Amino acid sequence: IIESDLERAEERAELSEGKCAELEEELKTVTNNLKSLEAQAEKYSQKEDRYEEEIKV
């Protein structure tokens, strides 16, 4: 039972590690997509500012 629970504890170490690694990849993916969207939103906020500067002009 204990060996099976070790296999399970280890499986859970692997599953939770596996999944946390999958989340690291999902996290990096959404972080990179966030950075892209943030950079995009920022490029737009910068364009908004360029226009705002030009709007004011």
Place this chain on the structure above:
Amino acid sequence: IIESDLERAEERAELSEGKCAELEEELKTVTNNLKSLEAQAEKYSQKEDRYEEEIKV
């Protein structure tokens, strides 16, 4: 011994699950930021156009 490895493996499952949950929380935070940023990148692209339109007008 197997139990000690189990406890450690379970501990790894808990530590890894800890990380899994942390990454999940970060994933969701970042993903939620991604989504708010998707909304902002688009609202901003729209503002890029509303402002561009204010310039054109």
